[PDB]
Amino acid sequence: MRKYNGYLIDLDGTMYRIDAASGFIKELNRLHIPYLFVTNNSTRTPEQVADKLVSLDIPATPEQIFTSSMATANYVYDLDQSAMIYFIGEEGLYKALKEKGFSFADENADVVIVGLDREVTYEKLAVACLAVRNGAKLISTNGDLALPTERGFMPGNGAFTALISHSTQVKATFVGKPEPIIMEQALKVLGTNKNETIMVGDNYDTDILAGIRAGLDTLLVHTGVTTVEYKQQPTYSMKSLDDWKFL
Amino acid sequence: MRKYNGYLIDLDGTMYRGTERIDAASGFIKELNRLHIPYLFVTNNSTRTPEQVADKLVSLDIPATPEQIFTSSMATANYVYDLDQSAMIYFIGEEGLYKALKEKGFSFADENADVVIVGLDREVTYEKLAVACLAVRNGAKLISTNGDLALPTERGFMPGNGAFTALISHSTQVKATFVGKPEPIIMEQALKVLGTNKNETIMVGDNYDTDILAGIRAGLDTLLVHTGVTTVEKLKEYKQQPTYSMKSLDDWKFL
């Protein structure tokens, strides 16, 4: 029997930016090991994310995708199902919140959720600040400061979360990586125990650190952010997924 | 013969709250005019033009010209100009900041700007903030007109200039140079315009944390009005204190 029969796999620079990941996933299916993709992305729906993976010869279904949008929508539901919500974000966050059946408000909201909105305005940020000062909770989908695009490093959701927090002097509760919350939620979905599940990623600051705080073993592959060049080391560290022995 | 032959009058704080302080300011300013003592109004504001502020002052029987109004946006523009006349500028802000940079005959640019200037823009967008981040990562200097995190309005506390500076600074991991109070740079730039010597100039305000502290850091003597026993006690435990503390502008001897 295997040591790890559960796999939480990162998308942000791990599954792509390559077909070394395709063979890795194919093998996981041949050994019939269940897995679940985890991403700090709060803009795309799971169906959208899954299609991008299939487009790169990577077996993925919408059910095998777990976003910070879904994790946040689940997390807030636990705190108060009748909570009226003001949110900043796009399609992905909006859908997940609506499927959960939340109502929506503005300055008089109970919970403020901060997701990436690449068309955010001063007024959108203003309503968020006003609601928080009225007593509303401040939740953020992810704390990523920079977003890698063709133009360069665009401002991430963490930066906009910083604005709101600074102006209101209220610290925010982050859901996505490296916070353990997104890992705890994904683990319930995957259905495997904490000691038989390993988190796979490329970035120590998000992926690896999320697994450690969650109590999960970690595999660090250098196909992304963190180079071979910290206080807690990952459980494993390799150049490629080709070096994984499926322990 | 005089110790203070140059005055820098704060517009912010609660300096002009109520008919009493307004008339006390009017007589104070008129006396400065009566004695031919040069003076200059100082503010962190960016929602008004020097023309607008001067028009409001004269309305309240307080003699002032647009040339006697000095904002942090003007200080920021002048400070950058003296450092680099050929600096290509991207800025986030409104009418006041735009006009201030216009007066300097700058060239403007986006992602390849040499200097990024952040001021309050109540119609800011993701793209506006994104361009700022891109330019900074392209090596542009990050300058902020002021650092106010919150802005008090009818609706409550709206996000201020400092909050947006924080976004850009956090995203690009580059620290910002703040010009407005309580930073000394705005007062240094005010002295340039006032024309008097630093040791012969006094800054007058009624708020320590933002207004007065800027003058102290700039090396100017400071007068703190609208103060009581309790507040003076507080300040005597700070690292720095105002040079003088009085209850009213009525109490000020011109030296």
Q: Is A156 on the interface with B (CB under 8 A)?
A: yes
- Placement of tokens 């000095």 in the chain: B70
Q: Which residues of A touch B138 (CB under 8 A)?
A: 152
What SS3 class is residue A188?
Answer: helix
Query: CB count, 10 Å around CB of A122?
Result: 17
Using the 8-state DSSP alphabet, how is residue A14 labeled? I
Residue B75 sits at the vertex; the CA angle it makes with B50 and B241, to the nearest 5 degrees, is 105
| Contact indicator for A67, A49 with CB cutoff of 8 Å | yes
**B182: phi then psi, degrees, rounded to nearest 5:** -85, 20
Q: Is B84 a catalytic residue?
A: no
CA atoms lying within 13 Å on the CB side of residue A52: 13
> Cα–chain-centroid distance for residue A162?
18
Q: In sequence order, what are the residues at sequence separation of 6 or more whose Cβ sits closer than 8 angstroms to the Cβ of residue A183?
A: A8, A38, A177, A199, A210, A211, A213, A214, A216
Could A167 and B173 be called an inter-chain contact, meaning their C-beta atoms sit closer than 8 Å? no
What SS3 class is residue A24?
Answer: helix
Antiparallel, parallel or unpaired: β B141-144 and B177-178? parallel
Q: How far apart are CA B63 and CA B29, in angstroms?
A: 7
Residue A25 sits at the vertex; the CA angle it makes with A23 and A27, to the nearest 5 degrees, is 70
> Cα–chain-centroid distance for residue B184?
9
Residue A240 sits at the vertex; the CA angle it makes with A235 and A246, to the nearest 5 degrees, is 55
> Cα–chain-centroid distance for residue A54?
20
Could A129 and B171 be called an inter-chain contact, meaning their C-beta atoms sit closer than 8 Å? no
| Contact indicator for A6, A198 with CB cutoff of 8 Å | yes
Q: How far apart are CA B212 and CA B210, in angstroms?
A: 6
DSSP of B145-179: S---SEEE-SSSEEE-HHHHHHHHHHHHT---EE-
Selected residues 96-125 of chain B with any CB under 8 Å from a CB in chain A: 111, 121-125
Using the 8-state DSSP alphabet, how is residue A177 labeled? T
Q: Is B150 on the interface with A (CB under 8 A)?
A: yes
In angstroms and rounded to an integer, the radius of gyration of the C-alpha atoms of chain B is 19
Antiparallel, parallel or unpaired: β B150-152 and B157-159? antiparallel
Q: Which fold has domain A80-175?
A: Rossmann fold (3.40.50)
**Is A194 marked as binding a ligand?**
no
Compute the Cα dihedral for A201, A206, A209, A211 and give only its sign: negative
Q: Which fold has domain A1-79+176-247?
A: Rossmann fold (3.40.50)
Could B133 and A154 be called an inter-chain contact, meaning their C-beta atoms sit closer than 8 Å? yes
Task: List the structure tokens of A204.
Answer: 């120590």
Judging by beta carbons within 10 Å of its beta carbon (0-12, 13-18, 19+), is residue A187 exposed, middle or buried?
A: buried
Q: How far apart are CA B204 and CA B212, in angstroms?
A: 7
Q: In sequence order, what are the residues at sequence separation of 6 or more whose Cβ sits closer than 8 angstroms to the Cβ of residue A92?
A: A41, A42, A43, A44, A45, A48, A67, A69, A115
DSSP of chain B: --S--EEEEE-STTTT-SHHHHHHHHHHHHHHHHTT--EEEEE---SS-HHHHHHHHHHTT----GGGEEEHHHHHHHHHHHH-TT-EEEEE--HHHHHHHHTTT-EE-STT-SEEEE---TT-BHHHHHHHHHHHHTT-EEEES---SEEE-SSSEEE-HHHHHHHHHHHHT---EE-STTSTHHHHHHHHHH---GGGEEEEES-IIIIIHHHHHHT-EEEE-S--HHHHHHHTTSS---SEE-S-GGG----
DSSP H or E stretch at residue A174: strand A173-174
Q: In sequence order, what are the residues at sequence separation of 6 or more whose Cβ sits closer than 8 angstroms to the Cβ of residue B14?
A: B21, B206, B207, B226
Question: Which residues on adjacent β-strands are paired with residue B159?
Answer: B150
* Contacts A–B by Cβ distance under 8 A: 92
Q: Is A130 on the interface with B (CB under 8 A)?
A: yes
| Contact indicator for B143, B97 with CB cutoff of 8 Å | no
* B203: nearest Cα among B33, B9, B31, B5: B9
Query: CATH 3.40.50.1000 occupies which residues in chain B?
Result: 1-83+180-255, 84-179
Nearest Cβ partner for B166 among A130, A163, A169:
A163
Q: How far apart are CA A212 and CA A235, in angstroms?
A: 9
| Contact indicator for A68, A141 with CB cutoff of 8 Å | yes
Q: How far apart are CA A114 and CA A67, in angstroms?
A: 14
**Is B10 marked as binding a ligand?**
yes
Q: To one decimal place, what's the resolution in Å? A: 2.4
DSSP H or E stretch at residue A218: strand A217-221
What SS3 class is residue A183?
Answer: helix
Altogether, the residues listed in chain A come to a count of 247
Is B84-179 in CATH node 3.40.50.1000?
yes
Q: In sequence order, what are the residues at sequence separation of 6 or more whose Cβ sits closer than 8 angstroms to the Cβ of residue A40?
A: A12, A68, A141, A142, A144, A176, A177, A182, A206
Query: CATH 3.40.50.1000 occupies which residues in chain A?
Result: 1-79+176-247, 80-175
| Contact indicator for B220, B187 with CB cutoff of 8 Å | yes
Enter the CATH code of domain B1-83+180-255: 3.40.50.1000
Task: List the structure tokens of B35.
Answer: 């004695």
Q: Which residues of B touch A163 (CB under 8 A)?
A: 159, 163-164, 166-167
| Contact indicator for B146, B72 with CB cutoff of 8 Å | yes
* Structure-determination approach: X-ray
Q: In sequence order, what are the residues at sequence separation of 6 or more whose Cβ sits closer than 8 angstroms to the Cβ of residue B183?
A: B146, B147, B214, B217
The amino acid occupying position B254 is: F
Task: List the structure tokens of A130.
Answer: 């006003």
Taking CA atoms, what residue in B is nearest to A167? B149
Q: Is B10 a catalytic residue?
A: yes
Judging by beta carbons within 10 Å of its beta carbon (0-12, 13-18, 19+), is residue B28 exposed, middle or buried?
A: buried
**Is B12 marked as binding a ligand?**
yes
Q: How far apart are CA A87 and CA A136, in angstroms?
A: 12
Q: Which residues of A touch B149 (CB under 8 A)?
A: 166-167, 169
**Is B110 marked as binding a ligand?**
no
Could B124 and A129 be called an inter-chain contact, meaning their C-beta atoms sit closer than 8 Å? no
The amino acid occupying position B167 is: L
| Contact indicator for A89, A67 with CB cutoff of 8 Å | no
**Long-range contacts of residues B238-242, Cβ cutoff 8 Å, at least 24 apart:** B238/B208, B240/B213, B240/B216, B242/B208, B242/B212, B242/B216
Q: How far apart are CA B71 and CA B79, in angstroms?
A: 12
Question: Which residues on adjacent β-strands are paired with residue B117?
Answer: B91, B143
Q: How far apart are CA B150 and CA B167, in angstroms?
A: 14
Task: List the structure tokens of B59.
Answer: 């309305």
Q: Which residues of A touch B170 (CB under 8 A)?
A: 145, 158-159, 162
Q: In sequence order, what are the residues at sequence separation of 6 or more whose Cβ sits closer than 8 angstroms to the Cβ of residue B112?
A: B88, B135, B138
DSSP of A123-156: HHHHHHHHHHHTT-EEEES----EEE-SSSEEE-
Q: How far apart are CA B144 and CA B161, in angstroms?
A: 8
